[PDB]
Ligand binder design. Structure first.
Ligand SMILES: [Fe+3]
Ligand SMILES: [Fe+3]
Ligand SMILES: [Fe+3]
Ligand SMILES: [Fe+3]
Ligand SMILES: [Fe+3]
Ligand SMILES: [Fe+3]
Ligand SMILES: [Fe+3]
Ligand SMILES: [Fe+3]
Ligand SMILES: [Fe+3]
Ligand SMILES: [Fe+3]
Ligand SMILES: [Fe+3]
Ligand SMILES: [Fe+3]
Ligand SMILES: [Zn+2]
Ligand SMILES: [Zn+2]
Ligand SMILES: [Zn+2]
Lengths: 167, 167, 167, 167, 167, 167
């Protein structure tokens, strides 16, 4: 194996490559959303900017894991990247609900990666997860939750005024 | 329940709430020491600034935990803040000695929360305590321990000189 | 008593202590509110911030009174700080209504404290109440009343827009 | 259909959607090269930076096309992004040669899109392809051809110095 | 023991001392290297400077551990610092290979020290190892590996050019 | 032998090497004093800064001699650095008294090297010792001698006041 590899379990090496794929798929979804709210019959620039930023940060997530793979001497495996779930994301409100669920789904995967890393006594990897993914996951889920509470109060008039505060 | 809650055990929720009350209780004790060192018959302006700053940090500890209750999607439930042990704190040394004892009692309970957090595999909350509370506790216990040594020396003139250090 | 004490009747000394408790219990109420309006299921950052500031300002009324007690040679006597009524304030309009009433409870005590100081021919203490307390109380009550008038115009879409004017 | 749609053939709409998936795929391939040249057993810091910017520029080729799909009032349709042809990319020169090939396959699809645009009398779309795509690919093919020539002249001391020019 | 000591098991106290010795012996190795590469018959200023910095950084890992021991109320126990293996490292590639292996010896102890702290439920000490030591160790090991990969391209003319990139 | 060696007796070479070990040994002793004045039960931050700076200058003395071994074309041969005499240094006065004794033992050996250098008519090395080491020794012995006088006075309060001089 690699000259730098030390205390690096192959089960961890492999969940990193599975997680990179999930980070990228999450990137693709926020990209689909981002430009959907830019359609002439949707015209929500606030929501569109928020989901463009989400897709960039999901891209950054994936890069930080590929950098990590190489740091420990593992070898990236990247699969295909599935097409997003849906493609018509409905209201801004249904988009945020979709995103809330996708961000909880990623946190479940990151809490699993953490347990797999604790179970192999990889305290470097648990440090990575705590300091760069667990805290970003909890803050974002709270961010989105806050937004869905503001935006559940029906009219299209309300979405548009909420949108402007996003922008 | 909550739209953000994920992997936050109800025992962690409950022990965050006891700990909000305990931090505020510490604020109240230090606040009492602060102003007692301002009595015209005590008039040590260095201990007064030290304990008033201590009182302030203890309220940030509590608020950081209340912020945290809400990030994870638990409910803040506040309780009555007991009045301090004393209102007359004796000497600066005897107040330091009581400071040190209560920072030590705050750390025992923070480490108990870390033990609850671990047992419920909540890495998000063990990281909160490691980075935000356990290093501040140790450093405080050590600064207070250092000053107790400098002051321990008996004399009234030595204390008024140590006091100007802390101004 | 004290080397400094002069024309400071003990009923005023004792009322200043009971007033310190009320102010500190007023702080606790507002801090409750402050972090309630930060819950993901509430998400009114403007209200939250208004109650944070109020909570901080009640803590300072308390410190001024404790500074004052020491200035006049009386002795601070701290007691327990009760937890609020209910920690679920409901809407912002309902919280503000609780605040209006709380500010009037503290105005009525402050005015009683001022009659005690007048009855006992303490003009230094009348002057403290007039300058440092009664004016903030009438400013605060009026502001709150102004805000309630604005907010009574029942849907949750109005509240979000008022919450931004306050942010 | 869309209230903005004018003179936008559905074949061109479909070819933009196909081309979006090709820009993204090129993004992914350049992402694999980028991070493969940062392996501890490859460690070519310049080749890696060159492909990072390539990967990023491909991503923005795709977002222009999706930006454009909406201007003309078509509907973005994204599909799976295939995994890159490889995982190892060999020497820096082999990665360029694969990138010479790849940019040429993109230029070929771009030029076919132009012919579709021309046959369906879309001068707005021919304009876009001429002004935002066709010139960057001729310019990129020439840059890469130049580098291949420099690097060809087998020994591996020479490759590390070429990386030097690249960082 | 100490007025400050709390939840600091004596096996961790003793391991911190043995770790201080290792770090200080790691400093000695690098200082040897540093001035070897400055001999007139060697004359690799870049290598020399790299090993000077490394030597200085090992001295600081040692100081942090001695600061830490005092923070937790244990007692520093210093012992002799062995002279290196051989003081003739030969080529730069051979020195770097010795450094890679040394950094992995210190990584394996640091990871053992971290299992000791975990076994003894010291989360303050796990946190110190994670933040302050394990991350530098994986960065350092990977860097060294990267440098060895670059340098294996056997003639002494390559080495001089790599030595300048490092200068 | 060396391409730079000229008029550098092998006895001078050998005595430079004993002296590198002796300077590093001094660094280690001062380093021990440095951190012992940081124990929570000693807590004299002025002696700690004085001895930590002393430890640092002693390592520059050693490195200046290793640089020098290589200027003249001799071989650095490093040896084991003995652990300090003590780890508990008693009072600041008793540590100063031990500082003074070891600066006096360093000067005896520097003057012995000057005597070896002279006898081997090496004016280059007698000038090194005159300008770089013998004036620093005398000045140190005198500063330490001055402080021993200021401190000698018995009392705990006087030492904590002298200590703030040195901060
Ligand atoms: Fe992510
Ligand atoms: Fe995410
Ligand atoms: Fe605290
Ligand atoms: Fe505290
Ligand atoms: Fe008030
Ligand atoms: Fe008030
Ligand atoms: Fe492209
Ligand atoms: Fe391209
Ligand atoms: Fe180290
Ligand atoms: Fe190291
Ligand atoms: Fe010296
Ligand atoms: Fe010396
Ligand atoms: Zn951390
Ligand atoms: Zn050749
Ligand atoms: Zn060459």
């Amino acid at each position: 194996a690699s000259q730098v590899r030390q205390n690096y379990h192959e089960d961890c090496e492999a969940s990193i490559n599975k997680q990179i794929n999930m980070e990228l798929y999450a990137s693709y979804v926020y990209l689909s959303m981002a430009y959907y709210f830019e359609r002439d019959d949707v015209a929500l620039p606030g929501f569109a900017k928020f989901f463009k930023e989400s897709s960039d940060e999901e891209r950054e997530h994936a890069q930080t894991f590929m950098k990590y793979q190489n740091k420990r001497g593992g070898r990236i495996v990247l699969q295909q990247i599935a097409a997003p779930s849906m493609r018509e994301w409905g209201t801004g409100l249904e988009a945020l609900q979709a995103a809330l669920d996708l961000e909880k789904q990623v946190n479940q995967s990151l809490l699993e990666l953490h347990s797999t890393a604790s179970g192999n006594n990889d305290p470097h990897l648990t440090k990575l997860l705590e300091d760069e993914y667990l805290e970003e996951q909890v803050d974002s889920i709270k961010k989105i939750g806050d937004m869905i509470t503001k935006l559940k109060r029906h009219h299209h008039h309300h979405e548009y005024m909420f949108d402007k505060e996003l922008n």
